[PDB]
Amino acid sequence: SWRDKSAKVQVKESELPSSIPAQTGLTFNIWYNKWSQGFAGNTRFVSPFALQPQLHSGKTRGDNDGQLFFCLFFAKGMCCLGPKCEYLHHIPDEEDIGKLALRTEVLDCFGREKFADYREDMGGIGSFRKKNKTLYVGGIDGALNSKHLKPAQIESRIRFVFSRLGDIDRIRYVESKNCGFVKFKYQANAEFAKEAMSNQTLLLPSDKEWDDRREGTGLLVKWANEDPDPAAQKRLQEELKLESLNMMVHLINNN
Template identity: 45%
Template sequence: VCPKGHECEYLHRLPTLHDLFNPNVDCFGRDKFNDYRDDMGGVGSFMRQNRTLYVGRIHATDDIEEVVSRHFAEWGQVDRIRVLTSRGVAFVTYTNEANAQFAKEAMAHQSLDHSEILNVRWATVDPNPLAQKREARRLEEQAAEAVRRALPADFVAELEGRDPEARKRKKIEGSFGLQGYEPPDEVWYTRTKELEDAGAAGQIEGSGQSLMIEPAAADSEAETGGGIFSSSAVAALRGLSGGNVTTKQAPKASGPLVAYGSDDESD
């Protein structure tokens, strides 16, 4: 029992999947480094998520896989175990990296069913292409699960096709009035692309028409009938008075308002 009780800042239990740790430290709060040590011991690196332990110096027996699984499953959920019986080596992969960190410290220099002293280190990257594909697929599934938790449940169900109402609505809309007809997915993709292209073309045509109409409207407002009022004002007045509006032309100036004479001209 810890003497600090509830004031202790450490967890006196095994880490779980729901425990969130800073990627720069391990489950014990120790700082990680940029790269692994030459002997692949120590805390580890924060550049790669490593869930696999190298376990060496195992007493070689026929049931070595069962023995390793029984002892290492005590520290967390084991994802996969690979055993090299002739060499007395096992690779233990945990589901959670924190459990691998805990198991590494718990099983270091310990023994299994015999008097051997285990050599527990971090495993290097598996060069097997199948293992690399499996790890990439696991990361994709983990990312998809994170996105699935962030989105609403009904939206995710509709995207994955698990919503019966969405399937029924899609079936009704996609029948095109033909009973018993179910269009393939290519029809939906083509129709969606046509709607997107039509919307983009409508936006382009609308902007072009506005550019053509605005100068014409400006010209019509600038036009005048040679009188006092412009043609647009006259049209508005005719609409109000029933069309009995006449415009008077402005008188043309016949000459200067004041006559003047020149000193060189005689009266």
């Protein structure tokens, strides 16, 4: 269990990356922390860091302080504070979902405040209106450094990495669109896994490409739109009816 050990320091303070982003203009703007005077070159890059849940999970100050929220940088695999962290260093579980069950309507599991509307990009923290449990997984070609790979092989990779990060309802890979969809049991695991897998590679140490994995752009993990598949739509309607019927019990017993 993660409860059996103190949390590992993922990255040392001296090993942390610089705050100045890669140059895309002629002058660095000290206010905005971004380059001005021109805009050329891509801003995406592969994360140097990746979470290793069985290795890095452990107790922190947050477990003793009665903390609710998870560590954003633990998910990113780059937390500097390790066991001195105020935030929880483990994959979310039903105990902690239960502890989050009040705040979850307006907050992320990382304690970030949700928005009314999704970004046009469908990236970011997500909407307090929707209660979405599904991640879109794009940029898969860049996440493999453009290595040719069979579709079932890609699906097996996505199955491995995302299943470390929570209980899962469904994974599907679409070959024509070259994108994956991962649905979790709890929205907190979708929130967590999005930040854990954003900008990562799908490559292995076993791959021939592993020694240049940093060169491209990583995984592009976003919120999913509603599934247009009619089978999925009627499944969604069935679970909506079931949720409604389960809620009638509470309203009746309370009044």
